Design a binder for this molecule. Sequence first.
Ligand code: HEM
Length: 152
Amino acid sequence: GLSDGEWQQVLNVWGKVEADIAGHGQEVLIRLFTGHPETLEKFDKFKHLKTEAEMKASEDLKKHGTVVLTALGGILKKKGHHEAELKPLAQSHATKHKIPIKYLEFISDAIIHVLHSKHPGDFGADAQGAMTKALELFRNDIAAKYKELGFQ
Ligand code: HEM
């Protein structure tokens, strides 16, 4: 649960992402795949990528980066009122993609890393706190749906 001041910070930071959603999305996925190679194995259409250069050169990875952050942005813009938006994502990730909640923790931290990397000195302590809380909220609500489904 975030305050309005905190949501304000979240949406302020998100303005940075929206100026270049494909670049951000690309770097998030790259940070995830290289940081946690087991995540790569969940993607049939990226499992071919062995090296980070191939990742960096992949237009389809950038495309998926756009899809992911577009979806996340839509959810963030709801400021917590995201049940309709989130449920199908929780369902597809638990039942079709079989993504453990741990991997959602991974990508959450990856977003934090990428924002610092692309905006050094421009991602303040207050901003990080707000973004972190927003991603925790997202993760926690997904986690509730995972429990419902009995998914590990
Ligand atoms: C902020 C976190 C995430 C968001 C917003 C997100 C969003 C999406 C969306 C919108 C799709 C396409 C529609 C669908 O299948 O539901 C998708 C597909 C997919 N996601 Fe996620 N996702 C997230 C995290 C993850 C993580 C952490 C993994 C694995 C480590 C993952 C694995 C997949 C896979 C394997 C697909 C299908 C890819 C394909 O074959 O086209 N997702 N995701």
